[PDB]
Coordinates of C-alpha atoms and ligand atoms in Angstrom, one line a residue:
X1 CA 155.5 121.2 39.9
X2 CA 155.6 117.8 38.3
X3 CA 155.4 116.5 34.8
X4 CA 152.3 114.4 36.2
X5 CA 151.3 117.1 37.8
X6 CA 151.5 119.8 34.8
X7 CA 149.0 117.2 33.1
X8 CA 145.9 118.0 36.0
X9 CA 143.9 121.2 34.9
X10 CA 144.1 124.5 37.4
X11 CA 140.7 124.4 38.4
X12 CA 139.3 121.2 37.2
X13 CA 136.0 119.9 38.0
X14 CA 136.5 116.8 40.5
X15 CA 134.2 114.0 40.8
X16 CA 134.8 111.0 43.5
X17 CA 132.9 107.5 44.1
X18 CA 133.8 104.8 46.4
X19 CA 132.9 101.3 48.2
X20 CA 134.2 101.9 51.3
X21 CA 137.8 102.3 51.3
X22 CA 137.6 101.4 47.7
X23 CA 138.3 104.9 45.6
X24 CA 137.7 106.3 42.3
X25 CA 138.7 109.9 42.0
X26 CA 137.5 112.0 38.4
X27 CA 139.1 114.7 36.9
X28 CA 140.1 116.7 33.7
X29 CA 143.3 117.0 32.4
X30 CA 145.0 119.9 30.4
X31 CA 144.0 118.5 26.7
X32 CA 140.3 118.3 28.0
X33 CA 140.4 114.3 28.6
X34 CA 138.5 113.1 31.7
X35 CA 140.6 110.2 34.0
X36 CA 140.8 108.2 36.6
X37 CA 142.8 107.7 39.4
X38 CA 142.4 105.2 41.9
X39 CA 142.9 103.7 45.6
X40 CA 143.1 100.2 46.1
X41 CA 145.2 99.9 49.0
X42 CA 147.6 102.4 47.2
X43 CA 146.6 105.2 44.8
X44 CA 148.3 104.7 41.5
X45 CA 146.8 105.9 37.6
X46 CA 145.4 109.3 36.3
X47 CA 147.7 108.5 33.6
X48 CA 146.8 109.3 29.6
X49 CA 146.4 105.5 29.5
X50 CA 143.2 105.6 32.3
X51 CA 140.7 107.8 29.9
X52 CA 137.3 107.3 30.1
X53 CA 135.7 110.5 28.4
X54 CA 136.1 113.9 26.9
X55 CA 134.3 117.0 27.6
X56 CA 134.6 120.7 26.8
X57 CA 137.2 122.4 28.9
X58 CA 136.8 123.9 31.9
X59 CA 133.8 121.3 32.3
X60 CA 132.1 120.5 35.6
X61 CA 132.0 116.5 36.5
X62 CA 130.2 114.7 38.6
X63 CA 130.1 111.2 39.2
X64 CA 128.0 108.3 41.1
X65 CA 127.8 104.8 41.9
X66 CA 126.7 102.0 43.5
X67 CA 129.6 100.1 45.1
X68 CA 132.1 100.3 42.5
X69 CA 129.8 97.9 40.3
X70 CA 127.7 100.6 38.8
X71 CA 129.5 103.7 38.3
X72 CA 128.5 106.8 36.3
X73 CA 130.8 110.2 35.3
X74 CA 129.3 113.4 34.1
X75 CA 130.3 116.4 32.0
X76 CA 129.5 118.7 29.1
X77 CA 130.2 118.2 25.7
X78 CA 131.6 121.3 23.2
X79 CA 128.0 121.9 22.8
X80 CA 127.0 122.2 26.4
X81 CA 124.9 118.8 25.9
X82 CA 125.1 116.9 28.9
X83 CA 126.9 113.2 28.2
X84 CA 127.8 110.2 30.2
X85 CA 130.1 108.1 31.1
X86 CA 128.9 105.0 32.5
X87 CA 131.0 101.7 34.1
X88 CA 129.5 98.2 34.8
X89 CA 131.3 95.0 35.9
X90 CA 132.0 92.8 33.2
X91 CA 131.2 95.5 30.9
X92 CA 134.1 97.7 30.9
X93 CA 133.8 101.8 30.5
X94 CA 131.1 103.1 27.5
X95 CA 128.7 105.8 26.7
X96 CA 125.2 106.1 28.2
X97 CA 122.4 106.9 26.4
X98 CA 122.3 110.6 27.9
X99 CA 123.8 112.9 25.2
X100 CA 121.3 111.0 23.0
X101 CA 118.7 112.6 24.7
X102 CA 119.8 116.1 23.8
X103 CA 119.7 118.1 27.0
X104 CA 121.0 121.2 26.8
X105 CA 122.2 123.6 29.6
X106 CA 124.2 126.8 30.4
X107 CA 127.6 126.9 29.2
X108 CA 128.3 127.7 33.1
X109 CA 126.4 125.0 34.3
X110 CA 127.6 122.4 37.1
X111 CA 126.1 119.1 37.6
X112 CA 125.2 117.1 40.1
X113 CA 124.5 113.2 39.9
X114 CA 123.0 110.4 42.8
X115 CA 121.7 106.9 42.4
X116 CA 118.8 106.9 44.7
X117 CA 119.6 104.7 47.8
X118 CA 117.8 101.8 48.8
X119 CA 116.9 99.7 45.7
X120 CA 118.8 97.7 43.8
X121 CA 117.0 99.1 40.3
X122 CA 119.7 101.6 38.4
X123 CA 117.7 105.0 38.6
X124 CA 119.7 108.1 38.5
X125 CA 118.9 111.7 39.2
X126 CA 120.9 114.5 37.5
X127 CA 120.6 117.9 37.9
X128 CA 122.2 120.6 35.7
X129 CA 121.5 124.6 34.9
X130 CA 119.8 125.4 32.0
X131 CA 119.8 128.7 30.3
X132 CA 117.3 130.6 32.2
X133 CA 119.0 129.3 35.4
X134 CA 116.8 127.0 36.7
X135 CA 118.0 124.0 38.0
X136 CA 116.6 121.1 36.3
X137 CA 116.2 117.8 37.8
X138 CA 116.8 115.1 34.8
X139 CA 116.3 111.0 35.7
X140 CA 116.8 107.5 34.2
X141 CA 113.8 105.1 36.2
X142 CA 114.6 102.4 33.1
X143 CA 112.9 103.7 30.3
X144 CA 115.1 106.3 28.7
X145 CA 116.3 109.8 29.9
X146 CA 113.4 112.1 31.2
X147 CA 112.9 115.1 32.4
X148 CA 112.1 115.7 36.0
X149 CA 111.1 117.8 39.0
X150 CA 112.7 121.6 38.0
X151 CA 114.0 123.7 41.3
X152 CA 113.9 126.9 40.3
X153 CA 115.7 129.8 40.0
X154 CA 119.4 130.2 41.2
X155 CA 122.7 132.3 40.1
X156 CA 124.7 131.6 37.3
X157 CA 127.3 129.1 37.4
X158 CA 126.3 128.2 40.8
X159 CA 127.5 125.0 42.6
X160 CA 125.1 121.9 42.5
X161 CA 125.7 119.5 45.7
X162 CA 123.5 116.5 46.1
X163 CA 123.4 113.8 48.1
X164 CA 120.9 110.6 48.8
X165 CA 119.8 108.1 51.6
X166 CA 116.8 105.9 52.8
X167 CA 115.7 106.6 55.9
X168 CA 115.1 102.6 58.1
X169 CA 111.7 104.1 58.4
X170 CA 110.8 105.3 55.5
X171 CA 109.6 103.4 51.8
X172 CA 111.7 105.2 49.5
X173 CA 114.5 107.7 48.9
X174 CA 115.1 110.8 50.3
X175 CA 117.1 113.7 47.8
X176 CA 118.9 116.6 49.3
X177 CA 120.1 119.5 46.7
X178 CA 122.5 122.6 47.7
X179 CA 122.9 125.2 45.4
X180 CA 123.6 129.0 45.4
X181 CA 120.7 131.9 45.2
X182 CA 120.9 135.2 43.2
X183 CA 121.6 137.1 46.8
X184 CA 124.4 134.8 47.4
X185 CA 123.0 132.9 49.7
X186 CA 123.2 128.8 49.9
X187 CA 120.3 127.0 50.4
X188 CA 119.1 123.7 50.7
X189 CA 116.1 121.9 48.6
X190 CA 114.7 118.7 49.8
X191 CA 112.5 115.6 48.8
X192 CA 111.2 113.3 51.1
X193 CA 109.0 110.2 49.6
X194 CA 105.6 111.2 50.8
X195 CA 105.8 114.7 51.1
X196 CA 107.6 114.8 47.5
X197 CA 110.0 118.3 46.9
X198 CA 109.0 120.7 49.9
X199 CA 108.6 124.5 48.4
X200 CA 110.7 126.1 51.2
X201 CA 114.1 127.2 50.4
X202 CA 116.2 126.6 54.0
X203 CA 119.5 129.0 54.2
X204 CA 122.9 127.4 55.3
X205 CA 125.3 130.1 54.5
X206 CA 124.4 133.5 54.9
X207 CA 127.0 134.6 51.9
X208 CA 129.4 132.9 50.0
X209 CA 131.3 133.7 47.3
X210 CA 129.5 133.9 43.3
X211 CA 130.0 130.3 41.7
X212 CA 131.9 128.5 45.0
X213 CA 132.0 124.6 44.2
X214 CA 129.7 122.5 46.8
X215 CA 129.7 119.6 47.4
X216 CA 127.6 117.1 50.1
X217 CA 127.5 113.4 51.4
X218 CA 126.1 111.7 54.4
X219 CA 126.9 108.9 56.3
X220 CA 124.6 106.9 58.9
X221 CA 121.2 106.9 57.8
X222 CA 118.6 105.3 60.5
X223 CA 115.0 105.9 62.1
X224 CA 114.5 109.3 61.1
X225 CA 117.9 110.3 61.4
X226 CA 120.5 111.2 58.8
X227 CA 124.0 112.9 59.6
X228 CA 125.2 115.4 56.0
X229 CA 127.7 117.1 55.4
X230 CA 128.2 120.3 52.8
X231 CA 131.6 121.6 51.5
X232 CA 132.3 125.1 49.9
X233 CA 134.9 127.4 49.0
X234 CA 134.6 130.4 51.0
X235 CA 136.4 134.3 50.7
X236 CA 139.5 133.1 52.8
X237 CA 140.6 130.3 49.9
X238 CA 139.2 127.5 52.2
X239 CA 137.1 124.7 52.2
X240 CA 134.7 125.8 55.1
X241 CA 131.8 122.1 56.4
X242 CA 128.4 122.8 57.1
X243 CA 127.3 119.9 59.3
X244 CA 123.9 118.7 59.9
X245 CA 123.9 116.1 62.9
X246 CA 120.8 114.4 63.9
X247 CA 119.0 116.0 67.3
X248 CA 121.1 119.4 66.4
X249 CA 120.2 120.5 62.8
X250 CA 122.7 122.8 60.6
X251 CA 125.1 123.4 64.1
X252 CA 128.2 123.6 62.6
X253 CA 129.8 125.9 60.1
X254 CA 133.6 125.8 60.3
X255 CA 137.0 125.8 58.1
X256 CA 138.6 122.9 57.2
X257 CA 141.5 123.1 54.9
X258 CA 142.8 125.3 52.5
X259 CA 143.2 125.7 49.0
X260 CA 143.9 127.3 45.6
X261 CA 141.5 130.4 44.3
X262 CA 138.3 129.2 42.9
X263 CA 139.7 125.3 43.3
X264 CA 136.7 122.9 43.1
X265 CA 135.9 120.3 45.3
X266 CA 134.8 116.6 45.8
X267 CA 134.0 114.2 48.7
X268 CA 133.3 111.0 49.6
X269 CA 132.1 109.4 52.7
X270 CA 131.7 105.4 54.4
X271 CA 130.4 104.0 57.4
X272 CA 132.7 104.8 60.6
X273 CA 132.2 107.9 59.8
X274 CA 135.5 107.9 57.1
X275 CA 135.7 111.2 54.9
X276 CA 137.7 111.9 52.0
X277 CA 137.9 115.6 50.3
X278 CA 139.5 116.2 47.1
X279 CA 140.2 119.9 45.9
X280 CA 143.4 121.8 44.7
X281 CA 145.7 123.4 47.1
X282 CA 148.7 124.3 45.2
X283 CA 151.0 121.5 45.3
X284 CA 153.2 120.9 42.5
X285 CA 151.1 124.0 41.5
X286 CA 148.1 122.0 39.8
X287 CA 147.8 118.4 41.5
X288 CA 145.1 117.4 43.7
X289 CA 145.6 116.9 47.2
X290 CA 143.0 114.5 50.1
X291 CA 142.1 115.9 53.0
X292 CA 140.5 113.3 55.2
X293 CA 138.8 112.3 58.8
X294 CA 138.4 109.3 60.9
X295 CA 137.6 108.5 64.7
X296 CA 141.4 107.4 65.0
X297 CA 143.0 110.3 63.9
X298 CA 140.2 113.6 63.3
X299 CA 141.3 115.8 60.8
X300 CA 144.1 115.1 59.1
X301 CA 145.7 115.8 55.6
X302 CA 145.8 112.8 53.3
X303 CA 147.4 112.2 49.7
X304 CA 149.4 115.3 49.3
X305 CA 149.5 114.7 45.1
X306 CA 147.5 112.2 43.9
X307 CA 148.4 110.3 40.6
X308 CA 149.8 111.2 38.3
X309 CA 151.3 113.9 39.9
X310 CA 153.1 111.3 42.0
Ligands
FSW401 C1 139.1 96.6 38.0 O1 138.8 97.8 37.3 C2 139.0 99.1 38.1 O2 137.8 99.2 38.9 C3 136.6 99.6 38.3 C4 135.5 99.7 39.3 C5 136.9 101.0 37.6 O3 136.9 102.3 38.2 C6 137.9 100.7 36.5 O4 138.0 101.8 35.7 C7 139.2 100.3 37.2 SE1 140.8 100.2 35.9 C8 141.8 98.7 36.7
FSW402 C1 121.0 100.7 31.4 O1 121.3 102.0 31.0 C2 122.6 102.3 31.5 O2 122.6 102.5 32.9 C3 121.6 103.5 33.3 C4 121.5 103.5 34.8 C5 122.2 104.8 32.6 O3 123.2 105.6 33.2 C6 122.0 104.7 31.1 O4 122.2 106.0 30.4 C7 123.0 103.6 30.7 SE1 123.0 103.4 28.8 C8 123.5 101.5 28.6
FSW403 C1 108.7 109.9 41.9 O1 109.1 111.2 41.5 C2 110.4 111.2 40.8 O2 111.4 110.6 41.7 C3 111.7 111.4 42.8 C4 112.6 110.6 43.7 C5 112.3 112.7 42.3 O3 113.6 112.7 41.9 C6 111.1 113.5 41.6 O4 111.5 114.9 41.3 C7 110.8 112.6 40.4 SE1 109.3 113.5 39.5 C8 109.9 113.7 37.7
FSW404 C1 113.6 116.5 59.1 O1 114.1 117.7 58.5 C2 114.4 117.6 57.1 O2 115.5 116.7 56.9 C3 116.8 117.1 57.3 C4 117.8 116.0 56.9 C5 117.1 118.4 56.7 O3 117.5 118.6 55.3 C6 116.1 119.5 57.1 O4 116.5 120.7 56.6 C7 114.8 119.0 56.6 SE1 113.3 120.3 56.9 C8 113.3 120.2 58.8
FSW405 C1 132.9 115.5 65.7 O1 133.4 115.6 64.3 C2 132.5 116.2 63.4 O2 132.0 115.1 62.5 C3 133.1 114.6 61.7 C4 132.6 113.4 60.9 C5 133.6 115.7 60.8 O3 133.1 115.8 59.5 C6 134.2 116.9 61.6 O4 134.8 118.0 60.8 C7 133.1 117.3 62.5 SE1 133.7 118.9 63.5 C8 131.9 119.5 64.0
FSW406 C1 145.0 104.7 55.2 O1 145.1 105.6 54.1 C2 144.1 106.7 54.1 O2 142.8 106.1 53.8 C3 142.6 105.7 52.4 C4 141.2 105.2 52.2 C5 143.0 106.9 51.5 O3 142.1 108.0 51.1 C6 144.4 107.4 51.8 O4 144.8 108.4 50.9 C7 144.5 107.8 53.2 SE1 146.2 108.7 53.7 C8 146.0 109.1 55.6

């Protein structure tokens, strides 16, 4: 290890926004404070000095944003209160109204945070575990923090990923939500602006393991067409990538890279397609490596320890 590096939590929650190339990676340090690190043709802070919240330890984060001009960070307070986070140009770092609206979950709850593409309004969908293990969507449309859609039942401590476009053909935004079942099973949960939340459940992983992180994006939105991709820890310490390619559906299951017991996981995406994964893989013991891909170079290992590790 590293003395930078014995400041990152073992198993910290990791959150990730970006404008393109552009990079804000989220996560908890030892003492329970949430910081920044970011890429601006060079990584560089995650320092004590780059703070922008505190949460309970052990807490999950999740993050969102639109460019780097609106961005929004996630976690649970000592009381298992979800509380925000929230950046604005000009404005600097502050706290959003969220934890003011009391929402309580599971003490093992993830969450999972999207602006909703295609407008330029500020609306937000959250979704968090509350204690009877629901997953409960919660949303900001402008006039205070609301409760929304709720998705039903899933396991304990399970993984939230979550990820939003606007079809060319389409009026509005569609939502798609990854968690984990009681039978182990991941599954998918979908909203579409016309036919609102469908009730089907569709399966893409047969069995993982109880409480992987997951984690989704997608890239190249069009007529119809949308191109996602899911990230989870599986049983052989990996990130394994469920892809869904327009024309071929869930094709794809595969490992990627690999990494620490029960490390969690992040990742971003831009047009190209560009991919950036953030988890923990054991170097200098507890910093957080990139793994990334590109059309120049395919799969390829990234940052090894991102600041302030090095
Ligand atoms: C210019 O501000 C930076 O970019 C913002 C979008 C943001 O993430 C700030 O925390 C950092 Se701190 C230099
Ligand atoms: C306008 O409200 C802010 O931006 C919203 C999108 C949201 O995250 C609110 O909680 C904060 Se509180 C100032
Ligand atoms: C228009 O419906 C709302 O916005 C959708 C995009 C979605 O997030 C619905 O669950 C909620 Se209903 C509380
Ligand atoms: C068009 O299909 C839908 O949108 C895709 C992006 C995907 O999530 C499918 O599972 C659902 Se249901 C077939
Ligand atoms: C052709 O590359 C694919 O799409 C890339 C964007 C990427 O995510 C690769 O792992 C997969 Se491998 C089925
Ligand atoms: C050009 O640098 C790469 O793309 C940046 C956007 C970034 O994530 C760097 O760590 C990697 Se290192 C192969």
């Amino acid at each position: 290890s590293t003395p930078g590096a014995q400041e990152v939590l073992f198993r910290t929650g990791i959150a990730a926004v970006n404008s393109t190339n552009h990079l804000r990676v989220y996560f908890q340090d030892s003492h329970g404070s949430i910081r920044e690190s970011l890429y601006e043709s060079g990584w560089a802070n995650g320092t004590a000095k780059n703070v922008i919240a505190k949460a309970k330890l052990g807490t999950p984060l999740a993050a969102t944003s639109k460019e780097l001009k609106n961005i929004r960070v996630y976690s649970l307070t000592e009381d298992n209160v979800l509380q925000e986070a929230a950046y604005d140009s000009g404005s600097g770092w502050y706290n959003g109204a969220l934890a003011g609206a009391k929402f309580t979950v599971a003490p093992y709850s993830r969450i999972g945070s999207v602006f909703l593409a295609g407008t330029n309004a500020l609306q937000l969908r959250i979704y968090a575990q509350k204690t009877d293990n629901t997953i409960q969507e919660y949303m900001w449309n402008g006039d205070g923090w609301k409760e929304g859609t709720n998705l039903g039942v899933a396991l304990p401590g399970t993984g939230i990923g979550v990820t939003c476009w606007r079809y060319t053909d389409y009026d509005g935004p569609s939502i798609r939500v990854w968690f984990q079942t009681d039978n182990l099973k991941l599954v998918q949960r979908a909203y579409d602006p016309h036919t609102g939340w469908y009730k089907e459940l569709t399966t893409i992983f047969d069995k993982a393991p109880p409480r992987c992180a997951i984690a989704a994006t997608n890239f190249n939105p069009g007529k119809s067409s949308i191109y996602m991709r899911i990230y989870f820890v599986n049983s052989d310490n990996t990130i394994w990538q469920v892809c869904w390619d327009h024309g071929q559906g869930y094709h794809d299951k595969r490992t990627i890279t690999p990494v620490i017991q029960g490390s969690e996981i992040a990742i971003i995406s831009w047009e190209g397609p560009e991919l950036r994964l953030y988890f923990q893989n054991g170097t200098y013991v507890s910093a957080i490596s990139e793994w990334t891909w590109g059309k120049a170079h395919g799969s390829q290992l990234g940052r090894r320890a991102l600041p302030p590790a090095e």
